[PDB]
Amino acid sequence: GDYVYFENSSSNPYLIRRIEELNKTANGNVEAKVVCFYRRRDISHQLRHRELFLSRQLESLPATHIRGKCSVTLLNETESLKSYLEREDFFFYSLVYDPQQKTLADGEIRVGNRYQADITDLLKEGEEDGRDQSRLETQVWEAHNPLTDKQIDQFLVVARSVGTFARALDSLHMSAAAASRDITLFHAMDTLHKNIYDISKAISALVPQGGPVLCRDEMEEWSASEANLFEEALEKYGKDFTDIQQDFLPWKSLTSIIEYYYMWKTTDRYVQQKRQAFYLHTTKLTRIARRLCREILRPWHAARHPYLPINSAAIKAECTARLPEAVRKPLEAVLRYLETHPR
Amino acid sequence: RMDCPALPPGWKKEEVIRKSGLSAGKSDVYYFSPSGKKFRSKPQLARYLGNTVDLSSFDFRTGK
Amino acid sequence: DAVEERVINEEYKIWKKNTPFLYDLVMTHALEWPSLTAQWLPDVTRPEGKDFSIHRLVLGTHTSDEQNHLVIASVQLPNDGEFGGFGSVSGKIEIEIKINHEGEVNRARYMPQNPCIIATKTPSSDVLVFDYTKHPSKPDPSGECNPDLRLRGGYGLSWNPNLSGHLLSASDDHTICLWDISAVPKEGKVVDAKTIFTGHTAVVEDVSWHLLHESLFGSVADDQKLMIWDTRSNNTSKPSHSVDAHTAEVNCLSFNPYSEFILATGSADKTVALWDLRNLKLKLHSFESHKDEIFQVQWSPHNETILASSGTDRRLNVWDLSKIGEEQSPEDAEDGPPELLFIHGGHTAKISDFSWNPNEPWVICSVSEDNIMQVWQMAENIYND
């Protein structure tokens, strides 16, 4: 259960291991079974200098390999260590590392005029904020009404009944459910507020001239064939609702298709789940000038000395002054010479 | 073929529903360059564009 | 840099004045971009009633900024009392074809059976094959590379001269690839490898088919090894033979065209080693004189007993191995050994590649990293007394 510092054979820092079993053989030789602590590099920064990871790698090595004993603490105990008690011997672990798999338990803030907000000064006791509230909001339901829960509830039932009777005038349970959806209710809560919470006045609103009112959400409102189009466009373009419109329902507004989508997801029948250029030819005079002046030129010397300047004047003088006047040996012979005179 | 606004101008995305077999009903997503070259995966698209776009956070399937 | 370039510049001028005494032919021509490859195409067209003949090359750029090209350039060699003999090039070396290449071309070689088809190694592991008869002569300013066959998988590249279609190569994963394009599919531009020979530990630099022997080929790598291979052998991992060739990274190899047994290898230890396939334990000869690393070595098409070698030290040494161990003067010892025939000091930079002319004897084309290519023939009196 102790932790030890083993030989690092490369010269590098010691390898750390936990002792699982200490064994002595018959000839008195001592060997140890040891679980490896891996260094962060070897695990192949938030990692501290002294991080070590508990591996599933198990090895056995002789006791002579141990050069020192150490402490590999919990993370909390490392962080609690005092400055004086800080040592070379103290290490820590907080991770188990599978060495075979590689598995392991399971950005700047700026300052300046172009980052911070200009802070709005507190108004004087005489100063006024100057903010037009009608440009900012428009009320849709007052919470302190002369009405009671019962009456509102009742009105909601009535708003629902009208709705069902409305759609009876151009499936019973279906029409009632249709009329019971939220759009109708919301419309019922506005009808109340618009009519100043006067039940008697609000009911007129619902039956303006003896005729009822119909509120239909995009779900109910779409035609059979539009609904059909939608189920083809979805199954074909997934949830790409701009293309679903462009190619399948271009007469509908995007935002109505969205509202429809979500309402459709609850459908019953819906079951998704289960340098320097030049030329040279050399004249036939300067060709045999080299042969005539072989002793001055020395082609054997000049061939392996391209950056020695050849005496161009001398051979030209001697060639004009002295105007009036090879077998290679085969490859069989040279290979025979090379073996005869070897390295 | 839908414009993909987060890619450079002219790039388009198309989603195709599989009509039969083992994955009938699943879809495949394709991208097209402005010239009409077809791409079938994120690493293929990233190799083509190179450093002209950063696709680290690009969701190939949704185009966002 | 400032001092060494002045010393190199002066030495180029000294060399330039010596050229009528050292050479029979020198044609300098600055390329737009430097070329890491060079090879003479085998065909020659000798026009009616002229004093020259049109020979053709296989060059290629390596710029990592602008669009690269696979280049075929045509040079016009002459047909064999005032002294000297200059007359500034002017329309002798000219580009015939440019083909837009995907990335830089490290090496490019023609297929012996069909010289129109050219393979091309890239810095990637795969090889691109082009046919210059298919593509137009002048490319547009596009750079939309159109390779006829991509062959998926050091500057190793070698077509098999006996079996048409078999191509060898190096790769970044320390292995030797082997493709076959004898019966490629119609609907199938891309081709994959027939065999991958592992063998070497470090990066394989150069590979070469044997000339007379269909099946067996050689290879060379940074792990100091010369590995002779055999395609018929079932185990594609252990080679047929293996030699500790040199004391450093071996960069190239080349077989003798007149002997099936003899081959040469060049290496980073500043030596070209001569070998025999009948006994690879014994190294026959080690050519010493090169100042720095040898990166290329080539035997002469016409003469069995001479070979050339280039590298990173600006010179291209030409070795005549018919005069090994000849009794030369004591002053001539300081020049070099007798087997060293000629030193070519025309280039002022690392000679990337060169190639012997197959039709005209003693003519070599060499290219360097100062973007100059030079066609040249050493003087007649040096190579025969």
Short mmCIF file of N, CA and C in Angstrom, two decimals, chain A residues 130-199:
data_model
loop_
_atom_site.label_atom_id
_atom_site.label_comp_id
_atom_site.label_asym_id
_atom_site.label_seq_id
_atom_site.Cartn_x
_atom_site.Cartn_y
_atom_site.Cartn_z
N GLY A 130 -38.53 60.68 -18.23
CA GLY A 130 -39.04 60.91 -19.58
C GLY A 130 -39.18 59.62 -20.37
N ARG A 131 -40.11 58.76 -19.96
CA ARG A 131 -40.39 57.50 -20.67
C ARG A 131 -41.88 57.28 -20.88
N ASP A 132 -42.29 57.30 -22.16
CA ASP A 132 -43.69 57.12 -22.55
C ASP A 132 -44.09 55.65 -22.44
N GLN A 133 -44.94 55.33 -21.47
CA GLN A 133 -45.28 53.94 -21.17
C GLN A 133 -46.15 53.26 -22.21
N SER A 134 -46.91 54.03 -22.98
CA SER A 134 -47.72 53.45 -24.05
C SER A 134 -46.88 52.99 -25.23
N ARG A 135 -45.72 53.62 -25.43
CA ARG A 135 -44.80 53.19 -26.48
C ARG A 135 -44.07 51.90 -26.08
N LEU A 136 -44.17 51.51 -24.80
CA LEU A 136 -43.43 50.36 -24.25
C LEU A 136 -44.28 49.12 -23.99
N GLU A 137 -45.55 49.31 -23.63
CA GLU A 137 -46.40 48.18 -23.27
C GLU A 137 -47.86 48.47 -23.59
N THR A 138 -48.66 47.42 -23.70
CA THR A 138 -50.12 47.57 -23.75
C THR A 138 -50.78 46.42 -23.02
N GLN A 139 -51.55 46.75 -21.99
CA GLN A 139 -52.04 45.76 -21.03
C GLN A 139 -53.08 44.84 -21.64
N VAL A 140 -53.06 43.59 -21.19
CA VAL A 140 -53.88 42.52 -21.77
C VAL A 140 -54.73 41.78 -20.73
N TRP A 141 -54.41 41.97 -19.46
CA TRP A 141 -55.22 41.41 -18.38
C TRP A 141 -54.88 42.11 -17.05
N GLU A 142 -55.88 42.75 -16.46
CA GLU A 142 -55.75 43.29 -15.13
C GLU A 142 -56.01 42.16 -14.13
N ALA A 143 -55.22 42.12 -13.06
CA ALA A 143 -55.29 41.04 -12.07
C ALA A 143 -56.26 41.32 -10.95
N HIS A 144 -56.64 42.58 -10.79
CA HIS A 144 -57.63 42.95 -9.80
C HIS A 144 -58.93 43.31 -10.51
N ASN A 145 -59.77 42.29 -10.68
CA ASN A 145 -61.04 42.41 -11.38
C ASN A 145 -62.22 42.35 -10.44
N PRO A 146 -63.31 43.05 -10.79
CA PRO A 146 -64.55 42.86 -10.05
C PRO A 146 -65.11 41.42 -10.12
N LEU A 147 -64.50 40.57 -10.94
CA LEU A 147 -64.95 39.19 -11.16
C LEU A 147 -64.27 38.23 -10.23
N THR A 148 -64.96 37.10 -10.00
CA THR A 148 -64.45 36.00 -9.18
C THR A 148 -64.00 34.86 -10.07
N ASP A 149 -63.13 34.01 -9.53
CA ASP A 149 -62.65 32.83 -10.26
C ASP A 149 -63.79 32.06 -10.91
N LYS A 150 -64.88 31.89 -10.18
CA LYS A 150 -66.01 31.13 -10.66
C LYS A 150 -66.53 31.72 -11.97
N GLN A 151 -66.77 33.03 -11.95
CA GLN A 151 -67.31 33.78 -13.11
C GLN A 151 -66.42 33.77 -14.32
N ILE A 152 -65.11 33.88 -14.09
CA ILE A 152 -64.15 33.81 -15.18
C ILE A 152 -64.19 32.39 -15.73
N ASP A 153 -64.09 31.41 -14.83
CA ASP A 153 -64.19 30.01 -15.21
C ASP A 153 -65.43 29.78 -16.06
N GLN A 154 -66.57 30.24 -15.55
CA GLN A 154 -67.85 30.13 -16.24
C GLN A 154 -67.78 30.77 -17.62
N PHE A 155 -67.23 31.97 -17.70
CA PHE A 155 -67.14 32.64 -18.97
C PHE A 155 -66.32 31.81 -19.92
N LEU A 156 -65.22 31.24 -19.44
CA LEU A 156 -64.40 30.39 -20.29
C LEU A 156 -65.19 29.20 -20.88
N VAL A 157 -66.09 28.63 -20.08
CA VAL A 157 -66.93 27.53 -20.57
C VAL A 157 -67.81 28.08 -21.68
N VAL A 158 -68.39 29.25 -21.43
CA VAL A 158 -69.25 29.85 -22.42
C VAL A 158 -68.49 30.14 -23.71
N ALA A 159 -67.30 30.73 -23.59
CA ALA A 159 -66.44 31.03 -24.75
C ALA A 159 -66.15 29.78 -25.56
N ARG A 160 -66.00 28.67 -24.85
CA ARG A 160 -65.83 27.37 -25.49
C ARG A 160 -67.09 26.87 -26.19
N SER A 161 -68.24 27.07 -25.58
CA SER A 161 -69.48 26.57 -26.14
C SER A 161 -69.81 27.27 -27.46
N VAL A 162 -69.70 28.60 -27.44
CA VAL A 162 -69.92 29.45 -28.63
C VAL A 162 -69.08 28.88 -29.77
N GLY A 163 -67.79 28.72 -29.47
CA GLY A 163 -66.81 28.23 -30.42
C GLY A 163 -67.22 26.93 -31.07
N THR A 164 -67.81 26.03 -30.29
CA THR A 164 -68.24 24.71 -30.80
C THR A 164 -69.47 24.90 -31.68
N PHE A 165 -70.39 25.74 -31.20
CA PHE A 165 -71.59 26.08 -31.93
C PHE A 165 -71.27 26.90 -33.18
N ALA A 166 -70.19 27.68 -33.13
CA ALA A 166 -69.72 28.42 -34.30
C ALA A 166 -69.32 27.46 -35.40
N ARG A 167 -68.49 26.49 -35.05
CA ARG A 167 -67.99 25.56 -36.07
C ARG A 167 -68.99 24.47 -36.42
N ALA A 168 -70.11 24.43 -35.71
CA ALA A 168 -71.26 23.63 -36.13
C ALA A 168 -71.99 24.30 -37.30
N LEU A 169 -71.96 25.63 -37.35
CA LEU A 169 -72.53 26.40 -38.46
C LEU A 169 -71.55 26.58 -39.64
N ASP A 170 -70.65 25.61 -39.89
CA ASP A 170 -69.78 25.61 -41.09
C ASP A 170 -68.74 26.74 -41.02
N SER A 171 -67.27 13.94 -34.84
CA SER A 171 -66.90 15.35 -35.00
C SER A 171 -67.43 16.24 -33.86
N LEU A 172 -68.46 15.81 -33.14
CA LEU A 172 -68.92 16.58 -31.98
C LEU A 172 -67.79 16.74 -30.96
N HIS A 173 -67.30 15.64 -30.40
CA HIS A 173 -66.18 15.72 -29.48
C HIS A 173 -65.00 16.49 -30.13
N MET A 174 -64.75 16.25 -31.42
CA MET A 174 -63.65 16.91 -32.15
C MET A 174 -63.78 18.43 -32.20
N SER A 175 -64.98 18.90 -32.52
CA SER A 175 -65.25 20.34 -32.55
C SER A 175 -65.13 21.00 -31.17
N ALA A 176 -65.57 20.27 -30.14
CA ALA A 176 -65.49 20.74 -28.76
C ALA A 176 -64.06 20.86 -28.29
N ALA A 177 -63.24 19.88 -28.67
CA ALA A 177 -61.83 19.90 -28.31
C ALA A 177 -61.15 21.01 -29.05
N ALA A 178 -61.50 21.14 -30.33
CA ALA A 178 -61.03 22.24 -31.19
C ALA A 178 -61.33 23.58 -30.56
N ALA A 179 -62.57 23.73 -30.09
CA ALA A 179 -62.99 24.95 -29.42
C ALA A 179 -62.41 25.12 -28.03
N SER A 180 -61.90 24.04 -27.45
CA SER A 180 -61.30 24.10 -26.12
C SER A 180 -59.82 24.39 -26.12
N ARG A 181 -59.22 24.53 -27.30
CA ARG A 181 -57.78 24.80 -27.36
C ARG A 181 -57.45 26.21 -26.86
N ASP A 182 -56.17 26.47 -26.64
CA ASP A 182 -55.74 27.63 -25.88
C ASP A 182 -56.09 28.94 -26.56
N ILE A 183 -55.94 28.97 -27.88
CA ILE A 183 -56.22 30.18 -28.68
C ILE A 183 -57.60 30.77 -28.37
N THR A 184 -58.59 29.89 -28.26
CA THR A 184 -59.94 30.27 -27.92
C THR A 184 -60.00 30.83 -26.50
N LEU A 185 -59.32 30.17 -25.57
CA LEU A 185 -59.25 30.64 -24.19
C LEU A 185 -58.56 32.00 -24.11
N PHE A 186 -57.37 32.10 -24.68
CA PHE A 186 -56.68 33.38 -24.66
C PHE A 186 -57.63 34.46 -25.20
N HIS A 187 -58.29 34.18 -26.32
CA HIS A 187 -59.21 35.15 -26.91
C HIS A 187 -60.32 35.49 -25.94
N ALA A 188 -60.71 34.51 -25.13
CA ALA A 188 -61.74 34.71 -24.09
C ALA A 188 -61.29 35.61 -22.94
N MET A 189 -60.03 35.50 -22.56
CA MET A 189 -59.47 36.39 -21.55
C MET A 189 -59.26 37.82 -22.04
N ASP A 190 -59.02 38.00 -23.34
CA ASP A 190 -58.91 39.35 -23.92
C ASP A 190 -60.27 39.98 -24.07
N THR A 191 -61.23 39.19 -24.53
CA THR A 191 -62.59 39.68 -24.70
C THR A 191 -63.12 40.24 -23.38
N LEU A 192 -62.75 39.60 -22.28
CA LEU A 192 -63.13 40.09 -20.98
C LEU A 192 -62.50 41.45 -20.73
N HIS A 193 -61.18 41.51 -20.83
CA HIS A 193 -60.43 42.73 -20.53
C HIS A 193 -60.77 43.93 -21.43
N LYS A 194 -60.93 43.67 -22.72
CA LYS A 194 -61.37 44.69 -23.65
C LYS A 194 -62.73 45.24 -23.28
N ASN A 195 -63.60 44.41 -22.73
CA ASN A 195 -64.93 44.86 -22.34
C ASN A 195 -65.01 45.29 -20.88
N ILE A 196 -63.86 45.58 -20.27
CA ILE A 196 -63.79 46.14 -18.90
C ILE A 196 -64.36 45.19 -17.84
N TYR A 197 -64.17 43.89 -18.07
CA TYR A 197 -64.66 42.85 -17.16
C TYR A 197 -66.17 42.91 -16.88
N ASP A 198 -66.92 43.37 -17.88
CA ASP A 198 -68.36 43.33 -17.86
C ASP A 198 -68.80 42.07 -18.60
N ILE A 199 -69.27 41.08 -17.84
CA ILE A 199 -69.67 39.79 -18.39
C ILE A 199 -70.71 39.97 -19.48
#
